[PDB]
């Protein structure tokens, strides 16, 4: 009760101050919110700790981030760059996987350990990227729409990979029955959202038995995140689709301001909890810094190349910007590593290498993405 | 993760539909939100269960309800009816306590069991009352301001009583050292809020190192709820004070719409969880319905009389309206009963009698308060 209310106060207070600090320094505001969590968490002040309640609030924040981002995104404008989104997603899976596997072989790993290394680099965690895009007011640009589209397909691809790795870790074989169930559920869910995108215009919510348009919008957004999560997709993918279902009507029922209000409250908790979780090891382990630095470079270059090649139609600046946006990694990578520990294919030093990579690809993305965006925008202006 | 996201969806969905239903029936919308929780909870559909995460979200909703209510309330307008707020609060403690104790003696209870019965009737839980006042747009009226003021003092009085009952249940004696620590912390907290009410005008938040006015407002609101809770006061008392600190500046930094957005999201979860918790016993126990009905009548009449006598300066209609608003009971009553079980002063049938009273005073208040308000407003109009 009171404990958890104090914790939230310390997070919001710290995140408000560090946001102000990073604004005044013209650095990415979202990195301030992460630092805030580091400061109040167990690494230093010890006022906030890992817990179930805070982590669920963190999850709601991410959901309302991408729910808000969906609101500002026409589906049709995603479809306009669908072929690029798709390419960016598949190459962003293949290339980091290949580089990770070949590097594994290079450093004496056996076959299965090498495959696990490669698969741990495959999934994008687009939350911090979407926050930056929103922060800089470029959600409507083509590199932004390619990123968001690629993130959705990358999450389907990520779940396929997760399902296969789960099966191998448990049964030792590829569980195609399980894989296909999840592909089916996924493409049906996504494809059905594209169809339900229509009913929102073709039926006004006067005749709908709800307390308010907003109340309807909130139930829909959370429900879509909920349905995504029950399939095994990330909740932020459902939230994003949920937002896009409502984008059409966002002005009419004045949805942007209240949903942005709620994001303003919870999304800082999301990024602050990233900080709270940061384990400032390994300094004791020496091989973790060498292989972990190289794996991080490979993880980043794989995504940066995927974006570059798949989005090259928009130019080198936009395409590298797309690539950087896909670089941050997250939970799916850690889970794969952990399932690898259960399968005997991964050791604790390999785990820490993946953890190291997850942390620094996450911190990397905003620092590269802010100036890359400015660089892309400068070019647009010079071409008039 | 996914489980809890599904649960929230079911609550919001049900609460949105039942809100619509109670609006179309001209019944209190907040009772719809409670019914919603009953329907989706274990009593029927079983889609939602009691849990830590949901209960903390419920708590945040109540906080943002009273935080919003504070925003619409000038401290000066509370002070204008301070003498009535104070009287209403003390009589609303004394009278239900006396009636409960004398009725206890009447039905064969011993001394200590009788005192515990009386003390269980003492505390107001103003959440559902404040929701109704807000719903009907009468937060500025004098009966509303007396209710809110009386609720704050009633929470201090409630904590005194709780602290004494805690001591008796543990040590068998009145722990005056503990009582006075808490009175000191309480009046200092409240009194200090009245002083900090000034600094908000006398210092603009340009020079403040925060990401945004809203972000500052959110940290302040939660922090005040947090500080209240750490003292042992209800978080909604801190939230209410937090809101009042910002009322002055609500228009200038446009705080009303975003804080209302957040209330719209979480407050329905609060009142829906009330429903989820409802245990539709006792039907098997026959004495619970007879003594529980009488205790509920006594609990209501005690508060209704306290409001009537302490607010009589506003007229019979406003004063009865004040009295009804103070009638709903809650957690402090159940805790007292439970501490009574530990002290040997309370039995399970007495507990169920208190539980019965908590439930029906809570459901009672909106049904009486809506027409009483209309009745008071009709009188104002007829006097012109
Ligand atoms: C229109 C807004 C969307 C509201 C969502 C409605 C609730 C449905 C969820 C039922 C339970 C999970 C659904 C599901 O697809 O299951 C797939 C797993 O593999 C097994 O649970
Ligand atoms: C054609 C219209 C232009 C593109 C769409 C418009 C986007 C609107 C959203 C404003 C968000 C800017 C501030 C922000 O990112 O806040 C992030 C969290 O709330 C935490 O503070
Ligand atoms: C239930 C156990 C904890 C789950 C949280 C997983 C993260 C742990 C490691 C430190 C932070 C790494 C960056 C990161 O995870 O960000 C990804 C976004 O938060 C998706 O939730
Ligand atoms: C949005 C990128 C377009 C910039 C065009 C080329 C160079 C000019 C200035 C860019 C500097 C980065 C923008 C920035 O600081 O973000 C605003 C904080 O989030 C709000 O405090
Ligand atoms: C201006 C907004 C208010 C922010 C609140 C700042 C944080 C302070 C809390 C420290 C721990 C509890 C404080 C306290 O009064 O203790 C009383 C108990 O009896 C013992 O914890
Ligand atoms: C002088 C100004 C008049 C008095 C103060 C104005 C009050 C403004 C708040 C509007 C609230 C009405 C709707 C409502 O109660 O919603 C409750 C939850 O959000 C759940 O839906
Ligand atoms: C931690 C254990 C559960 C705590 C919740 C206490 C309520 C239980 C009984 C059923 C509902 C009675 C009405 C009621 O409690 O409302 C009071 C407002 O919710 C204050 O939180
Ligand atoms: C606010 C009380 C002033 C009423 C004056 C005397 C009689 C006229 C009509 C009162 C009926 C109750 C008001 C009401 O239904 O509330 C509005 C829903 O909350 C919004 O759907
Ligand atoms: C009828 C709606 C029930 C609520 C949940 C949504 C619908 C289906 C739930 C899970 C049933 C199995 C999924 C499926 O269709 O694919 C089966 C694989 O391809 C066999 O390997
Ligand atoms: C490269 C192109 C990518 C396209 C991916 C296509 C995936 C499959 C489509 C799913 C269509 C619905 C199937 C269905 O309703 O149920 C399938 C039975 O029940 C499983 O046994
Ligand atoms: C099947 C058992 C019957 C009991 C209730 C369950 C069935 C459906 C939900 C009732 C919801 C009531 C509001 C409603 O849907 O009507 C709204 C108008 O279209 C607009 O006036
Ligand atoms: C200096 C600020 C520390 C942070 C928390 C706020 C201040 C005081 C914390 C608890 C100290 C005891 C409370 C008190 O002053 O009263 C003592 C009884 O009257 C003795 O029975
Ligand atoms: C009927 C009138 C009601 C007035 C209630 C007055 C309660 C007490 C005032 C508290 C003033 C601050 C005292 C303080 O700072 O510390 C007190 C030492 O440390 C305790 O040993
Ligand atoms: C004591 C150790 C020093 C390290 C930092 C801790 C001390 C204070 C907090 C720093 C907050 C930075 C922003 C700030 O407060 O300045 C805001 C201007 O008044 C407006 O320009």
PDB file of C-alpha atoms in Angstrom, chain B residues 70-267:
ATOM      1  CA  UNK B  70      -9.407  18.667  -4.713  1.00  0.00           C
ATOM      2  CA  UNK B  71      -8.535  20.426  -7.976  1.00  0.00           C
ATOM      3  CA  UNK B  72     -12.100  21.778  -8.160  1.00  0.00           C
ATOM      4  CA  UNK B  73     -12.047  22.922  -4.520  1.00  0.00           C
ATOM      5  CA  UNK B  74     -10.669  26.189  -3.142  1.00  0.00           C
ATOM      6  CA  UNK B  75      -9.180  25.713   0.345  1.00  0.00           C
ATOM      7  CA  UNK B  76     -10.745  29.056   1.258  1.00  0.00           C
ATOM      8  CA  UNK B  77     -14.162  27.631   0.348  1.00  0.00           C
ATOM      9  CA  UNK B  78     -13.527  24.723   2.726  1.00  0.00           C
ATOM     10  CA  UNK B  79     -12.464  27.143   5.481  1.00  0.00           C
ATOM     11  CA  UNK B  80     -15.689  29.102   4.945  1.00  0.00           C
ATOM     12  CA  UNK B  81     -17.556  26.080   6.341  1.00  0.00           C
ATOM     13  CA  UNK B  82     -14.823  24.821   8.663  1.00  0.00           C
ATOM     14  CA  UNK B  83     -16.886  25.034  11.843  1.00  0.00           C
ATOM     15  CA  UNK B  84     -19.620  22.929  10.235  1.00  0.00           C
ATOM     16  CA  UNK B  85     -17.076  20.451   8.840  1.00  0.00           C
ATOM     17  CA  UNK B  86     -15.617  20.024  12.258  1.00  0.00           C
ATOM     18  CA  UNK B  87     -18.895  19.520  14.026  1.00  0.00           C
ATOM     19  CA  UNK B  88     -20.129  17.102  11.451  1.00  0.00           C
ATOM     20  CA  UNK B  89     -16.996  15.065  11.846  1.00  0.00           C
ATOM     21  CA  UNK B  90     -16.998  14.835  15.666  1.00  0.00           C
ATOM     22  CA  UNK B  91     -20.737  14.099  15.955  1.00  0.00           C
ATOM     23  CA  UNK B  92     -20.424  11.621  13.100  1.00  0.00           C
ATOM     24  CA  UNK B  93     -17.945   9.774  15.331  1.00  0.00           C
ATOM     25  CA  UNK B  94     -19.628  10.118  18.728  1.00  0.00           C
ATOM     26  CA  UNK B  95     -23.195   9.234  17.758  1.00  0.00           C
ATOM     27  CA  UNK B  96     -22.630   6.068  15.753  1.00  0.00           C
ATOM     28  CA  UNK B  97     -20.161   4.963  18.440  1.00  0.00           C
ATOM     29  CA  UNK B  98     -22.679   5.530  21.231  1.00  0.00           C
ATOM     30  CA  UNK B  99     -25.566   3.871  19.409  1.00  0.00           C
ATOM     31  CA  UNK B 100     -23.405   0.885  18.515  1.00  0.00           C
ATOM     32  CA  UNK B 101     -22.175   0.432  22.069  1.00  0.00           C
ATOM     33  CA  UNK B 102     -25.632   0.797  23.655  1.00  0.00           C
ATOM     34  CA  UNK B 103     -27.090  -1.624  21.125  1.00  0.00           C
ATOM     35  CA  UNK B 104     -24.262  -4.024  21.935  1.00  0.00           C
ATOM     36  CA  UNK B 105     -25.150  -3.891  25.627  1.00  0.00           C
ATOM     37  CA  UNK B 106     -28.801  -4.380  24.620  1.00  0.00           C
ATOM     38  CA  UNK B 107     -28.083  -7.708  22.840  1.00  0.00           C
ATOM     39  CA  UNK B 108     -26.057  -9.252  25.658  1.00  0.00           C
ATOM     40  CA  UNK B 109     -22.539  -8.218  24.621  1.00  0.00           C
ATOM     41  CA  UNK B 110     -19.952  -7.751  27.358  1.00  0.00           C
ATOM     42  CA  UNK B 111     -18.190  -4.395  27.839  1.00  0.00           C
ATOM     43  CA  UNK B 112     -15.213  -4.797  25.497  1.00  0.00           C
ATOM     44  CA  UNK B 113     -17.182  -6.523  22.713  1.00  0.00           C
ATOM     45  CA  UNK B 114     -19.678  -3.658  22.918  1.00  0.00           C
ATOM     46  CA  UNK B 115     -16.970  -1.026  22.629  1.00  0.00           C
ATOM     47  CA  UNK B 116     -15.561  -2.745  19.542  1.00  0.00           C
ATOM     48  CA  UNK B 117     -18.990  -2.755  17.921  1.00  0.00           C
ATOM     49  CA  UNK B 118     -19.321   0.963  18.547  1.00  0.00           C
ATOM     50  CA  UNK B 119     -15.838   1.821  17.292  1.00  0.00           C
ATOM     51  CA  UNK B 120     -16.437  -0.121  14.056  1.00  0.00           C
ATOM     52  CA  UNK B 121     -19.143   2.397  13.070  1.00  0.00           C
ATOM     53  CA  UNK B 122     -17.022   5.496  13.538  1.00  0.00           C
ATOM     54  CA  UNK B 123     -15.154   5.988  10.245  1.00  0.00           C
ATOM     55  CA  UNK B 124     -16.473   7.428   6.988  1.00  0.00           C
ATOM     56  CA  UNK B 125     -15.170   6.191   3.627  1.00  0.00           C
ATOM     57  CA  UNK B 126     -15.933   9.165   1.403  1.00  0.00           C
ATOM     58  CA  UNK B 127     -14.824   7.815  -1.981  1.00  0.00           C
ATOM     59  CA  UNK B 128     -18.235   6.801  -3.315  1.00  0.00           C
ATOM     60  CA  UNK B 129     -19.794   9.962  -1.885  1.00  0.00           C
ATOM     61  CA  UNK B 130     -17.220  12.195  -3.610  1.00  0.00           C
ATOM     62  CA  UNK B 131     -17.834  10.379  -6.893  1.00  0.00           C
ATOM     63  CA  UNK B 132     -21.557  11.162  -6.745  1.00  0.00           C
ATOM     64  CA  UNK B 133     -20.956  14.823  -5.913  1.00  0.00           C
ATOM     65  CA  UNK B 134     -18.596  15.080  -8.868  1.00  0.00           C
ATOM     66  CA  UNK B 135     -20.986  13.167 -11.113  1.00  0.00           C
ATOM     67  CA  UNK B 136     -23.866  15.586 -10.454  1.00  0.00           C
ATOM     68  CA  UNK B 137     -21.747  18.723 -10.817  1.00  0.00           C
ATOM     69  CA  UNK B 138     -22.364  19.990  -7.288  1.00  0.00           C
ATOM     70  CA  UNK B 139     -18.812  19.963  -5.926  1.00  0.00           C
ATOM     71  CA  UNK B 140     -19.019  23.737  -5.353  1.00  0.00           C
ATOM     72  CA  UNK B 141     -22.177  23.593  -3.201  1.00  0.00           C
ATOM     73  CA  UNK B 142     -21.949  24.085   0.563  1.00  0.00           C
ATOM     74  CA  UNK B 143     -23.087  20.544   1.464  1.00  0.00           C
ATOM     75  CA  UNK B 144     -20.331  19.194  -0.764  1.00  0.00           C
ATOM     76  CA  UNK B 145     -17.639  21.333   0.841  1.00  0.00           C
ATOM     77  CA  UNK B 146     -18.826  20.373   4.346  1.00  0.00           C
ATOM     78  CA  UNK B 147     -18.718  16.670   3.385  1.00  0.00           C
ATOM     79  CA  UNK B 148     -15.161  16.882   2.054  1.00  0.00           C
ATOM     80  CA  UNK B 149     -13.937  18.934   5.019  1.00  0.00           C
ATOM     81  CA  UNK B 150     -15.637  16.590   7.477  1.00  0.00           C
ATOM     82  CA  UNK B 151     -14.108  13.599   5.690  1.00  0.00           C
ATOM     83  CA  UNK B 152     -10.587  14.952   6.226  1.00  0.00           C
ATOM     84  CA  UNK B 153     -11.112  15.516   9.968  1.00  0.00           C
ATOM     85  CA  UNK B 154     -13.020  12.227  10.199  1.00  0.00           C
ATOM     86  CA  UNK B 155      -9.929  10.471   8.771  1.00  0.00           C
ATOM     87  CA  UNK B 156      -7.710  11.986  11.488  1.00  0.00           C
ATOM     88  CA  UNK B 157     -10.284  10.941  14.098  1.00  0.00           C
ATOM     89  CA  UNK B 158     -10.470   7.523  12.456  1.00  0.00           C
ATOM     90  CA  UNK B 159      -6.717   6.996  12.724  1.00  0.00           C
ATOM     91  CA  UNK B 160      -6.709   7.984  16.399  1.00  0.00           C
ATOM     92  CA  UNK B 161      -9.366   5.355  16.999  1.00  0.00           C
ATOM     93  CA  UNK B 162      -7.503   2.800  14.895  1.00  0.00           C
ATOM     94  CA  UNK B 163      -4.259   3.426  16.791  1.00  0.00           C
ATOM     95  CA  UNK B 164      -5.997   2.969  20.162  1.00  0.00           C
ATOM     96  CA  UNK B 165      -7.757  -0.201  19.052  1.00  0.00           C
ATOM     97  CA  UNK B 166      -4.493  -1.568  17.678  1.00  0.00           C
ATOM     98  CA  UNK B 167      -2.824  -0.979  21.034  1.00  0.00           C
ATOM     99  CA  UNK B 168      -5.637  -2.611  22.998  1.00  0.00           C
ATOM    100  CA  UNK B 169      -5.641  -5.642  20.703  1.00  0.00           C
ATOM    101  CA  UNK B 170      -1.876  -6.054  21.054  1.00  0.00           C
ATOM    102  CA  UNK B 171      -0.916  -4.824  24.536  1.00  0.00           C
ATOM    103  CA  UNK B 172      -4.275  -4.558  26.295  1.00  0.00           C
ATOM    104  CA  UNK B 173      -3.754  -0.852  27.045  1.00  0.00           C
ATOM    105  CA  UNK B 174      -4.235   2.595  25.534  1.00  0.00           C
ATOM    106  CA  UNK B 175      -0.949   3.534  23.865  1.00  0.00           C
ATOM    107  CA  UNK B 176      -1.080   7.294  24.321  1.00  0.00           C
ATOM    108  CA  UNK B 177       2.503   7.727  23.121  1.00  0.00           C
ATOM    109  CA  UNK B 178       1.445   6.227  19.796  1.00  0.00           C
ATOM    110  CA  UNK B 179      -1.854   8.112  19.599  1.00  0.00           C
ATOM    111  CA  UNK B 180      -0.153  11.458  20.122  1.00  0.00           C
ATOM    112  CA  UNK B 181       2.659  10.770  17.652  1.00  0.00           C
ATOM    113  CA  UNK B 182      -0.030  10.223  15.022  1.00  0.00           C
ATOM    114  CA  UNK B 183      -2.123  13.262  15.976  1.00  0.00           C
ATOM    115  CA  UNK B 184       1.060  15.327  15.802  1.00  0.00           C
ATOM    116  CA  UNK B 185       2.079  13.922  12.427  1.00  0.00           C
ATOM    117  CA  UNK B 186      -1.487  14.357  11.157  1.00  0.00           C
ATOM    118  CA  UNK B 187      -2.186  17.967  12.169  1.00  0.00           C
ATOM    119  CA  UNK B 188       1.328  18.952  11.111  1.00  0.00           C
ATOM    120  CA  UNK B 189       0.759  17.334   7.694  1.00  0.00           C
ATOM    121  CA  UNK B 190      -2.656  18.961   7.216  1.00  0.00           C
ATOM    122  CA  UNK B 191      -1.579  22.298   8.676  1.00  0.00           C
ATOM    123  CA  UNK B 192       1.578  22.279   6.567  1.00  0.00           C
ATOM    124  CA  UNK B 193      -0.511  21.633   3.448  1.00  0.00           C
ATOM    125  CA  UNK B 194      -2.483  24.774   4.288  1.00  0.00           C
ATOM    126  CA  UNK B 195       0.818  26.686   4.358  1.00  0.00           C
ATOM    127  CA  UNK B 196       2.222  25.053   1.207  1.00  0.00           C
ATOM    128  CA  UNK B 197      -1.072  26.025  -0.428  1.00  0.00           C
ATOM    129  CA  UNK B 198       0.529  29.474  -0.669  1.00  0.00           C
ATOM    130  CA  UNK B 199       3.911  28.634  -2.267  1.00  0.00           C
ATOM    131  CA  UNK B 200       2.122  27.378  -5.375  1.00  0.00           C
ATOM    132  CA  UNK B 201       0.937  30.888  -6.278  1.00  0.00           C
ATOM    133  CA  UNK B 202       3.980  32.685  -4.885  1.00  0.00           C
ATOM    134  CA  UNK B 203       6.388  30.679  -7.083  1.00  0.00           C
ATOM    135  CA  UNK B 204       5.697  29.792 -10.733  1.00  0.00           C
ATOM    136  CA  UNK B 205       7.046  26.435 -11.919  1.00  0.00           C
ATOM    137  CA  UNK B 206       9.111  27.852 -14.784  1.00  0.00           C
ATOM    138  CA  UNK B 207      12.139  27.968 -12.481  1.00  0.00           C
ATOM    139  CA  UNK B 208      11.264  24.456 -11.259  1.00  0.00           C
ATOM    140  CA  UNK B 209      13.373  21.597 -12.692  1.00  0.00           C
ATOM    141  CA  UNK B 210      10.553  19.419 -14.046  1.00  0.00           C
ATOM    142  CA  UNK B 211       9.625  18.031 -17.449  1.00  0.00           C
ATOM    143  CA  UNK B 212       6.193  19.642 -17.359  1.00  0.00           C
ATOM    144  CA  UNK B 213       3.546  21.287 -15.123  1.00  0.00           C
ATOM    145  CA  UNK B 214       1.461  18.124 -15.402  1.00  0.00           C
ATOM    146  CA  UNK B 215       4.417  15.953 -14.491  1.00  0.00           C
ATOM    147  CA  UNK B 216       4.951  18.124 -11.431  1.00  0.00           C
ATOM    148  CA  UNK B 217       1.238  17.943 -10.568  1.00  0.00           C
ATOM    149  CA  UNK B 218       1.263  14.145 -10.803  1.00  0.00           C
ATOM    150  CA  UNK B 219       4.328  13.756  -8.583  1.00  0.00           C
ATOM    151  CA  UNK B 220       2.837  16.134  -6.010  1.00  0.00           C
ATOM    152  CA  UNK B 221      -0.543  14.391  -5.958  1.00  0.00           C
ATOM    153  CA  UNK B 222       0.934  10.902  -5.574  1.00  0.00           C
ATOM    154  CA  UNK B 223       3.514  12.117  -3.058  1.00  0.00           C
ATOM    155  CA  UNK B 224       0.844  13.682  -0.862  1.00  0.00           C
ATOM    156  CA  UNK B 225      -1.190  10.464  -1.021  1.00  0.00           C
ATOM    157  CA  UNK B 226       2.030   8.634  -0.191  1.00  0.00           C
ATOM    158  CA  UNK B 227       2.870  10.848   2.792  1.00  0.00           C
ATOM    159  CA  UNK B 228      -0.700  10.532   4.126  1.00  0.00           C
ATOM    160  CA  UNK B 229      -0.492   6.746   3.827  1.00  0.00           C
ATOM    161  CA  UNK B 230       2.883   6.549   5.574  1.00  0.00           C
ATOM    162  CA  UNK B 231       1.343   8.405   8.541  1.00  0.00           C
ATOM    163  CA  UNK B 232      -1.601   5.990   8.494  1.00  0.00           C
ATOM    164  CA  UNK B 233      -4.133   8.422   7.050  1.00  0.00           C
ATOM    165  CA  UNK B 234      -6.064   7.295   3.974  1.00  0.00           C
ATOM    166  CA  UNK B 235      -4.246   8.001   0.693  1.00  0.00           C
ATOM    167  CA  UNK B 236      -7.367   9.776  -0.621  1.00  0.00           C
ATOM    168  CA  UNK B 237      -6.992  12.400   2.093  1.00  0.00           C
ATOM    169  CA  UNK B 238      -3.499  13.255   0.858  1.00  0.00           C
ATOM    170  CA  UNK B 239      -4.691  13.196  -2.749  1.00  0.00           C
ATOM    171  CA  UNK B 240      -7.492  15.585  -1.852  1.00  0.00           C
ATOM    172  CA  UNK B 241      -5.104  18.010  -0.191  1.00  0.00           C
ATOM    173  CA  UNK B 242      -2.701  17.581  -3.102  1.00  0.00           C
ATOM    174  CA  UNK B 243      -5.460  18.560  -5.496  1.00  0.00           C
ATOM    175  CA  UNK B 244      -6.368  21.612  -3.427  1.00  0.00           C
ATOM    176  CA  UNK B 245      -2.746  22.819  -3.485  1.00  0.00           C
ATOM    177  CA  UNK B 246      -3.083  22.941  -7.283  1.00  0.00           C
ATOM    178  CA  UNK B 247      -6.693  24.190  -7.607  1.00  0.00           C
ATOM    179  CA  UNK B 248      -5.447  27.764  -7.855  1.00  0.00           C
ATOM    180  CA  UNK B 249      -3.383  26.983 -10.933  1.00  0.00           C
ATOM    181  CA  UNK B 250      -5.618  24.333 -12.530  1.00  0.00           C
ATOM    182  CA  UNK B 251      -6.745  26.552 -15.431  1.00  0.00           C
ATOM    183  CA  UNK B 252      -3.362  28.203 -16.015  1.00  0.00           C
ATOM    184  CA  UNK B 253      -1.412  24.966 -16.619  1.00  0.00           C
ATOM    185  CA  UNK B 254      -4.541  23.189 -17.935  1.00  0.00           C
ATOM    186  CA  UNK B 255      -4.484  20.456 -15.276  1.00  0.00           C
ATOM    187  CA  UNK B 256      -8.182  19.591 -15.100  1.00  0.00           C
ATOM    188  CA  UNK B 257      -8.449  17.714 -18.367  1.00  0.00           C
ATOM    189  CA  UNK B 258      -5.407  15.453 -18.018  1.00  0.00           C
ATOM    190  CA  UNK B 259      -6.073  14.580 -14.357  1.00  0.00           C
ATOM    191  CA  UNK B 260      -9.712  13.902 -15.283  1.00  0.00           C
ATOM    192  CA  UNK B 261      -8.456  11.687 -18.109  1.00  0.00           C
ATOM    193  CA  UNK B 262      -6.491   9.589 -15.635  1.00  0.00           C
ATOM    194  CA  UNK B 263      -9.416   9.439 -13.175  1.00  0.00           C
ATOM    195  CA  UNK B 264     -11.647   8.243 -16.016  1.00  0.00           C
ATOM    196  CA  UNK B 265      -9.282   5.300 -16.517  1.00  0.00           C
ATOM    197  CA  UNK B 266      -8.577   4.197 -12.919  1.00  0.00           C
ATOM    198  CA  UNK B 267     -11.589   5.262 -10.810  1.00  0.00           C
TER     199      UNK B 267
END
